Nucleic acid binder design. Structure first.
Lengths: 53, 320
RNA sequence: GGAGCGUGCGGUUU
RNA sequence: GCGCUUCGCUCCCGGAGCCCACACU
RNA sequence: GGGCUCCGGAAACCGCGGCGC
């Protein structure tokens, strides 16, 4: 998967930055998922943190 | 970037001063969380990997839902916008099916060719195509837009009419261009009224928010996760109907002309329509038996045959 | 129970 | 060998339930 | 007679047939 985004200014591209607005690019095709979902509670705690839950 | 659904209509007024009693109704805004789900669709961002249904599969289990369905079947490897409609709202998917769809692609040519030729050729498609896969029905390509070309990789966006297969569109270009090409990576950017905006959410976010709701009792997040079925018809031409009529169409009444309060421009014979309350909730879906103007000038006969109704009965008092 | 979106059929058993 | 071969939807048919409804004088 | 809502194999594991690694 080569396509990348720079979601803030919302532009796809295969490059590492969107010079037009200087935001680095993340990979387009969003993190895989298994119903297992280990890291489940482990991530949950990281989120609860940035919200204050 | 213009598809067939981004042309703005006018709000045509029939009953210049009409009103609705709050006492019997639930506007999309403030429905109780537990029923917002009964009547929601999640704008899902499908990960690669799972088939499209096998996603819905997990959405069910993990949210202890019974009955939920999805929009345009997005294949295993495609990522992107996959409206998944829940509980009683399941069939709104009907609405979605024959709407626009935008993709970001990444065709990969099986041989070199002059940058501009690629551009020249792909722009050749903007219009109608007759489908030619490897060794009969026509399909529209509303627009192609080439983002970047690196070597034989061609990253583009493209908008298409329901049930174009992008793989083919590419294979076709492939032959058009001479060298032959294969589609390397794909992603759906929008299905119709479901865009890649702030409402599009990833499995993970969905689950984590849902757990914030059960373990933690925070409603907020897991609500902003689900979209109210109304957004599943946003693209359809709507007709707002006065209160008394609501109760009726519910029970299986075809909506007759003097129910209409507000109307949309440019409706025709046999077009899908969204029957709405003045509270802007989805009542039902139908085929118009009467054009836009026809409905506004008249008071005799029926506007829309009703064919599927979402609105529940007790929601509006009977009275007719 | 059929037709189709979508390749289907025969055995222990809600 | 391992994975998938369908969440579900639509048309018809059978069964259960609700109506017959131009949305007031 | 028509309209609407709900249901109509909702069951795991097993043999080909059918696509994919």
């Amino acid at each position: 998967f080569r396509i990348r985004k720079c979601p803030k200014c919302g532009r796809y591209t295969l490059k590492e930055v969107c010079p037009v607005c200087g935001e680095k690019t993340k990979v387009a095709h969003p993190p895989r998922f298994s119903p297992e979902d280990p890291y489940g509670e482990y991530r949950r705690r990281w989120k609860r943190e940035v919200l204050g839950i | 970037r213009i598809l067939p659904a981004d042309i703005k209509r006018e709000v045509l007024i029939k009953d210049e001063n009409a009103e609705t009693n709050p006492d019997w109704g639930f506007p999309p805004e403030k429905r109780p969380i537990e029923m917002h789900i009964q009547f929601g669709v999640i704008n899902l961002d499908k990960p690669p990997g799972p088939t499209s249904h096998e996603v819905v599969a997990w959405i069910k289990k993990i949210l202890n839902l019974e009955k939920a369905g999805h929009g345009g079947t997005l294949d295993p490897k495609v990522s992107g916008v996959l409206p998944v409609a829940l509980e009683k709202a399941t069939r709104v998917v009907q609405a979605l099916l024959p709407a626009g769809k935008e993709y970001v692609a990444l065709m990969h040519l099986h041989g070199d060719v002059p940058e501009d030729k690629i551009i020249q050729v792909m722009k050749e498609f903007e219009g109608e195509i007759i489908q030619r896969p490897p060794l009969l029905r026509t399909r529209k390509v509303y627009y192609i837009e080439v983002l970047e070309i690196e070597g034989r990789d061609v990253l583009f966006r493209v908008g298409v009419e329901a049930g174009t297969y992008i793989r083919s569109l590419i294979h076709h270009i492939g032959l058009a261009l001479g060298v032959g090409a294969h589609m390397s990576e794909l992603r759906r950017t929008r299905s119709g009224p479901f865009k890649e905006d702030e409402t599009l959410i990833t499995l993970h976010d969905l689950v984590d928010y849902y757990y914030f709701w059960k373990e933690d009792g925070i409603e907020e997040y897991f609500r902003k996760a689900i979209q109210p079925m109304e957004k599943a018809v946003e693209h359809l031409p709507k007709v707002w109907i006065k209160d008394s009529a609501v109760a009726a169409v519910t029970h299986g009444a075809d909506l007759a002309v003097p129910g209409i309060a507000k109307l949309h421009a440019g409706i025709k014979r046999g077009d899908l329509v969204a029957i709405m309350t003045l509270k802007d909730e989805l009542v039902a879906l139908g085929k118009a038996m009467m054009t836009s103007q026809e409905m506004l000038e008249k008071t005799k006969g029926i506007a829309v045959d009703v064919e599927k109704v979402f609105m529940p009965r007790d929601w509006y008092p009977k009275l007719w």
